[PDB]
């Protein structure tokens, strides 16, 4: 490909700055717009004690040894089901 | 800010026979002794931990 733009006669500092502010950052702003729009907590799914999930072959070296490191009560059930 | 590299160049090229890790002054000495103490101490501590775990506590 060749993109859809042009320059190339001499790729220098001004050109890359132009790309930072004119392409790169605006793209980040659009994806920031889209993301903080499609967010919103999705209704947590019903708990089913599936044997291939919530694995516990050895307790974690922290807490009560049953909570994952970034455990989120709202969405991460314990092997026995969601928390109170 | 101002460019003070020249000063630092002078200090580090100063012929005092000091190895680069201590050529910056007394602080280097301190940091070194702290580092070395932690390493040697922790290592000793680690040997103790090994000795402890080597035997059954039934």
């Amino acid at each position: 490909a060749s993109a859809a733009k042009g320059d190339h006669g001499g790729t220098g500092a001004r050109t890359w700055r132009f790309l930072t502010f004119g392409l790169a950052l605006p793209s980040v702003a659009l994806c920031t717009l889209n993301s903080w729009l499609h967010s919103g907590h999705r209704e947590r799914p019903a708990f089913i004690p599936y044997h291939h999930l919530r694995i516990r072959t050895k307790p974690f070296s922290w807490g009560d040894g049953n909570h994952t490191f970034f455990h989120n009560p709202r969405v991460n059930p314990l092997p026995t089901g969601y928390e109170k | 800010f101002e460019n003070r590299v020249a000063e630092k160049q002078k200090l580090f090229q100063e012929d005092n026979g000091l190895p680069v890790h201590l050529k910056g002054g007394a602080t280097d000495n301190i940091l070194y002794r702290v580092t070395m103490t932690l390493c040697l101490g922790g290592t000793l501590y680690s040997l103790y931990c090994l000795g402890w775990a080597s035997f059954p506590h039934k």
Partner: protein, 259 residues
């Protein structure tokens, strides 16, 4: 006197302290994992930080201050960095191999399907796409920083490098948020396993790359870099691209194709 351009390094204690810090951390993790104690691990991490700081400090002293980095010494450092990145790539290779092995032939325990039964994948068009535009954008800004530095523009080099770092931090925060919002955990089978371990390690590389960039930032402020000699910056930038590229693969494989 020497009539060659190579660097004869002053006897240093850093290799030993680093070696010992390695022993303290591995020993430390074992102590943590089995004898419920973090003391050793704590000391290990500390001596390690101390070692790295002093070791690289000396490297800056030997180069910027002592002039030991002749074109030949610098040429060697380029090779060293390229070889280092290569081994880091191969390390990831093992993880991508694990991912593809598990995802292409889902076992009966997963319900013979991918993603496994009971796993609800994040949407690749949401935070993952954002994360992607963030890293790609930092790639553009770091390139502007490089050209600014080569063109002798101090202000704009600092400006661009700062933007790059912010983006790296932004990515790191977004990813930590995602880890917390994720309905699945590392304990959720081979899917959780491959996901967090791969993106986990990549997350760590991003943190390291960022730190490297920050070091360059401060060395820039202190005028360490000349418009023609700034290998520390070049290495940090190569490392940054490496990190960016690994993300693209994670994105395409785990987040997009793997959902």
């Amino acid at each position: 006197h020497q009539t060659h351009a190579y660097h004869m390094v002053n006897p240093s204690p850093w290799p030993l302290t680093g070696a010992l810090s390695a022993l303290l951390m591995t020993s430390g993790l074992t102590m943590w994992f089995h004898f419920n104690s973090m003391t050793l691990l704590m000391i290990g991490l500390t001596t390690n930080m101390l070692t790295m700081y002093q070791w690289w400090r000396d490297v800056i002293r030997e180069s910027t201050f002592q002039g030991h980095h002749t074109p030949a010494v610098q040429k060697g450092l380029r090779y060293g960095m390229i070889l280092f990145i290569i081994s880091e790539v191969l390390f990831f290779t093992g993880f991508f191999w694990a991912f593809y092995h598990s995802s292409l032939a889902p076992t009966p325990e997963l319900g013979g399907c991918w993603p496994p039964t009971g796993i609800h994948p994040l949407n690749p068009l949401e935070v993952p796409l954002l994360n992607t535009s963030v890293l790609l954008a930092s790639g553009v800004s770091i390139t502007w920083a490089h050209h600014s530095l080569m063109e002798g523009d101090r202000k704009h080099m600092l400006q661009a490098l700062f933007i790059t770092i912010t983006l790296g931090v932004y990515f790191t925060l977004l990813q930590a948020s995602e880890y917390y919002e994720a309905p699945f955990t590392i304990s959720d089978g081979v899917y959780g396993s491959t996901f967090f371990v791969a993106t986990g390690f990549h997350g760590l590389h991003v943190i390291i790359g960022s730190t490297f960039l920050i070091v360059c930032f401060f060395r820039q402020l202190k005028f360490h870099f000349t418009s023609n000699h700034h290998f520390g910056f070049e290495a940090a930038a190569w490392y940054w691209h490496f990190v960016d590229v690994v993300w693209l693969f994670l994105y395409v494989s785990i987040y997009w194709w793997g959902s």
